[PDB]
Structure 1
Amino acid sequence: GPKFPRVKNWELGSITYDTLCAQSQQDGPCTPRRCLGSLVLPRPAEQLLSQARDFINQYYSSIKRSGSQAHEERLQEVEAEVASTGTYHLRESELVFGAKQAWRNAPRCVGRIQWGKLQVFDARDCSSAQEMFTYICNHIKYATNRGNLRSAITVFPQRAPGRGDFRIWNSQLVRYAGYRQQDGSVRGDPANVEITELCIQHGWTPGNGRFDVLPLLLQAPDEAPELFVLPPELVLEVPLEHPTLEWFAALGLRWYALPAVSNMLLEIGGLEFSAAPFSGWYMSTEIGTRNLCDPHRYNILEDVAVCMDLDTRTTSSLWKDKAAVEINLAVLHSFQLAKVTIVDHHAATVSFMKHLDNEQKARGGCPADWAWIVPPISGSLTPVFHQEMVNYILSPAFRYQPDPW
């Protein structure tokens, strides 16, 4: 019957059709001959105006003034502005709508039930690296809120004709250093080897711990990036303990409270915000499974398994699975004890299922990347594993962008 993707939930037996995917203006990486859904990185003039017009149409739809005189006047304002300057500028409320929509549109985010609750800090007046730092500190303070975390984004000035970009060089506001050793191994977080060395190249005096907070390397237009040390009192961390394994605290593990992504581009109506850091709170598997157990990250599975006295000499003891579960439990327990917002992967995926239903009714579908939405432990124990998903690109969007260096 319906000429749209049919989407099945295999746990419940229920069927929906995604009609929203029709509004996709941008190609993904798949073709009829081959699916590239699992790749992490899939490989203006009148063009701007059409993205602009579409965005303005979306704005006026969301305030229910679509076709109105205020709607037609905004369209004319935008084309006039582009006509004379090659670019245009968003009203404050358009920025707020666009940032929330970009989050709503992100297929890889399992946290989207929260999308309507986003504090948008408008930092489009920023004109130096020093001021970026003040804005970032204010963001961190607001978002951290002594452990009661609050979703926020800070938006620095858009890319502009000729002029250099605003960029935060760091991939997150909080990152632990990774120091390449003589033997070729890494102390700290191997994910951060390159940013760490950039920080040293730019004058930072390196420490030598497993959990040294990195400075921020902030770049204002047409200038070299500048180095800023976060005041330690602004970076809330949680030492890790386990509810019943008393030795786990002795491992001296910790993670920071605030996940704040700083290297993504926010695109709204064809305008490009190259510095627009955003933060929410962690889902517990990000820390306990990926950051702590990935082989190319802290890689602590075997140390924990040994402390647990498990048989690490054979795969069939399920030592990796047992250790990972206890590490995840330690993350959840430690964040709870410390009163820092965190969400477990069961609670998060249940809420994402609710989000899917809300969006089916509001927009006729919801772009979702199954490989990313399904948690990295206990996949089929969560309701999302059993849910088919349609992945597609809608704008406004958060997008990857090349590293500034």
Structure 2
Amino acid sequence: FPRVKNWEVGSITYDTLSAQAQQDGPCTPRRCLGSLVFPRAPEQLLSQARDFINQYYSSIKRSGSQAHEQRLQEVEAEVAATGTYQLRESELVFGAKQAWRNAPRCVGRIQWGKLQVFDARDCRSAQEMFTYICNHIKYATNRGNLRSAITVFPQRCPGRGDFRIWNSQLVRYAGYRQQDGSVRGDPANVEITELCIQHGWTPGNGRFDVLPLLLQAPDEPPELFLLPPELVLEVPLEHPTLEWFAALGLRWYALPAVSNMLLEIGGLEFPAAPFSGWYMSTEIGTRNLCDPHRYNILEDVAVCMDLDTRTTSSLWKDKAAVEINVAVLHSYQLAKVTIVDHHAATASFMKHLENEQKARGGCPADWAWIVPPISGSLTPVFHQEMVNYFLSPAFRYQPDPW
């Protein structure tokens, strides 16, 4: 059992939960590959289902009971008859929460129990899918008082294709390859933008054009759906004391809603199950606006700030990035849209680790993703050793459907 030290306080704990990791990651005793972004049959379906049913009945303080063994035999009977099985509603709710709880790269997991689960497993078409998605966005956005939510579409099943959302998030800004060779808008989204156009979207030419949705029903080409503008809540960016900042014309959207990941519960796979929370400000201020391969505004802000950009040792990059994050926090607070700064987020994650140590004997965590991209060692998670491993239920990456 790995020993884990907090270097700020002196705390020492052991992660006994890692011993239960029943899927393998990319590291070996030869070489650690922890820094890599993408590090990745009825009997085996049965053993996954069995373990998850055990988890569920443990959670309802009913381990080993009549109802517990009843469900086991029921699931085996159904796999033997149909090749698969169906989750009960309460199991789907529990499994979606555990998948969030188990996500090693999520710093916001203190919230894991407060998750609205929308059961869309009856969804019939891409058009019904769109209506489900709009209701998710409306509920989650809640006029700026954001609420965590997931909508679960029908599971993968033999004999029919998958439901898929092609977009990586429900809200994304277009990225248009340009004049010279630049990108106008978000360079991360050049591919999905070109797919939308190919599928009949009439592009705009702004820097913050919200993308339409490409939604795939089983054994169907994807279908294009425009989001009503009044459903997509956005925040214009201003700075509390730098008045020229508003003239940058920058915006970001309220709702972070990941839509391209696969939800796995008890061996069943839901390739369409978009989930949303609220932003940590560094995601917007540091990564989305300052990454060199994203909006890349850092030098322009630093020039406007009259910083000396010809020498690195003036720390112009650091100073401009800090004020961009200030602008994000101030703008969302002004707009009354939920946001959490990286100091509050990491302190609440420390409490989650402590809650999880008592409840489960540990917590899977990916240090490089938990530590924020600015001011790392000023937050307490920097000084916390962590153990990264894969538990199920889980959210997993999956290939792009095109």
Q: Same fold (TM over 0.5)?
A: yes
Deviation at 1:183, TM superposition (A): 1.1
Alpha-carbon distance in structure 1 between the residues aligned to 2:105 and 2:331: 26
| Range with greater deviation from structure 2 (35-44 or 109-118) | 35-44
The alpha carbon displacement at 1:321 in A equals 0.3
Q: CA deviation at 1:40?
A: 0.3
**Within 2, Cα distance between the matches of 1:317 and 1:199?**
43
Partner secondary structure for residue 400 of structure 2:
coil
- Superposed CA RMSD: 0.4
Q: Distance in 2 between matches of 1:250 and 1:174?
A: 23
Q: TM-score, normalised by structure 2?
A: 1.00
Equivalent residue number for residue 177 of structure 2 = 180
Q: What's the CA shift for 1:45?
A: 1.2
Give per-residue Cα distances to partners, 1:226-274, cap 9 Å, x unaligned.
0000000000000000010011011110000000000000000000000
1:292 aligns with 2:283: no
What is the CA deviation profile of residues 272-322 of structure 1, one whole-angstrom value per residue up to 9, with x for unaligned ones? 000000000000000000000000000000010010001111111100000
Q: String of CA shifts for 1:322-342, please: whole Å, max 9, x gaps.
A: 000000000000000000000
**1:23 CA displacement:** 1.0
* DSSP 3-state at the match of 1:187: strand
Task: Give the secondary-structure state (helix, strand or coil) at the position aligned to 1:161.
Answer: coil
| CA-to-aligned-CA distance 1:150-175 (integer Å, 9 cap, x gap) | 00000000001131000000000000
Count of matched residue pairs: 402
- State the alpha-carbon separation in 2 of the partners of residues 275 and 60 from structure 1: 26
- For 1:336-371, what per-residue CA distance to the aligned partner results, in whole angstroms no more than 9, with x for missing partners? 000000000000000000000000000000000000
Measure, in 2, the Cα distance between the counterparts of 1:275 and 1:43.
19
Which string of whole-angstrom CA distances, capped at 9 and with x for unpartnered residues, describes residues 26-60 of structure 1? 01100001000000001321010000000000000
After superposition, the C-alpha distances for 1:128-148 in whole angstroms (9 at most, x for unaligned) are: 000000000000000000000
Give the superposition deviation at 1:182: 2.9
Distance 1:388 1:359 in 2: 15
Contact preservation (8 Å) 2:239, 2:327 = yes
Name the CA distance, whole Å, in 2 between partners of 1:145 and 1:318.
40
Corresponding residue of 2:220? 223
Q: CA separation in 1, counterparts of 2:304 and 2:391?
A: 47
Give the distance between the partners of 2:19 and 2:66, measured in 1 at CA. 27
Q: Distance in 2 between matches of 1:255 and 1:300?
A: 14
Match of 1:356 among 353, 357, 378: 353
Distance 1:170 1:355 in 2: 31
Residue 213 of structure 1 deviates from its aligned partner by 0.3
- 2:25–2:40 Cα contact (<8 Å) kept: no
Q: Kindly indicate whether residue 312 of structure 2 is the aligned counterpart of residue 315 of structure 1.
A: yes
Deviation at 1:7, TM superposition (A): 0.1
Q: CA deviation at 1:24?
A: 0.6
Distance of 1:319 and 1:178 partners within structure 2: 28
- Per the TM alignment, residue 86 of structure 1 is displaced from its structure 2 partner at its CA by 0.3
Residue 209 in structure 1 maps to residue 203 in structure 2: no
Q: For the residues of structure 2 that align with 1:393 and 1:318, how far apart are their CA atoms?
A: 38
Q: Contact conserved, 2:150 with 2:274, CA < 8 A, in 1?
A: yes
- For structure 1, the residue ranges without an aligned partner over 5 or more in a row are none
Distance 2:40 2:311 in 1: 39
Residue in structure 1 matched with residue 142 of structure 2 by the alignment = 145
Partner of residue 340 from structure 1, selected from 317, 337, 341: 337
Q: 1:253 aligns with which of 228, 239, 250?
A: 250
SS in 2 for 1:179: strand
Q: Structure 1: how far apart are the matches of 2:74 and 2:47?
A: 14
Q: Secondary structure at the residue paired with 1:255?
A: strand
Tell me which residue corresponds to 2:10: 13
Between 174-183 and 374-383, the greater mean CA deviation after superposition: 174-183
Following the alignment from structure 2 to structure 1, what is the Cα–Cα distance between the partners of residues 29 and 395? 26
Q: Secondary structure at the match of 1:218?
A: strand
CA separation in 1, counterparts of 2:388 and 2:192?
Answer: 31
CA distance in 2, matches of 1:44, 1:375: 41
> Matches of 1:248 and 1:176 in 2, distance apart?
20
Structure 2 stretches lacking a partner, 5+ long: none
Q: Secondary structure at the match of 1:366?
A: coil
Per-residue deviation, 1:105: 0.1
Whole-angstrom CA distance in 1 between matches of 2:291 and 2:365: 24
TM-superposed CA distance for 1:225, in Å, is 0.3
Any conservation in 1 of the 2:215–2:222 contact (CA below 8 Å)? yes
Aligned to 1:161: 158
- Does structure 1 retain, via aligned residues, the 8 Å contact 2:6–2:12? yes
Question: How far apart, in 1, do the equivalents of 2:153 and 2:118 lie?
Answer: 9
Which string of whole-angstrom CA distances, capped at 9 and with x for unpartnered residues, describes residues 46-88 of structure 1?
Answer: 0100000000000000001111010000001000000000000
Shift of 1:184: 1.0
Distance in 1 (CA, whole Å) between partners of 2:20 and 2:61 is: 18
1:403 deviation in Å?
0.3
Shift of 1:99: 0.1
Who is 1:44 aligned against? Answer: 41
4+ aligned runs moved over 3 Å, structure 1: none
